[PDB]
Every structure is written in structure tokens, then in C-alpha cells.
Amino acid sequence: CGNLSTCMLGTLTQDFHKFHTFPQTNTGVGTP
């Protein structure tokens, strides 16, 4: 990170990483 908008883009990329591998992912980011 380095500024707010970059942390929000990073959190969006983590959120996409979550939703890419799995649907229920909010309990297990790389897990079924």
C-alpha cells in the first residue's frame, strides 16, 4: 500500500482473489 485508494484497490484485489477461487470464501479465502 501507500495511500487510501491503493489500499482500497488492494482490498478489491483480495476480494476478487477470494471470489475467484471459491463462493463461500469469506470464511476461508483459499478453502472450500
Curated annotation (Swiss-Prot):
Residues bearing the modification Proline amide: 32
Disulfide bonds: 1-7
Top-rank taxon, per record: Eukaryota
Role summary: Calcitonin is a peptide hormone that causes a rapid but short-lived drop in the level of calcium and phosphate in blood by promoting the incorporation of those ions in the bones. Calcitonin function is mediated by the calcitonin receptor/CALCR and the CALCR-RAMP2 (AMYR2) receptor complex.
Name this protein carries in UniProt: Calcitonin
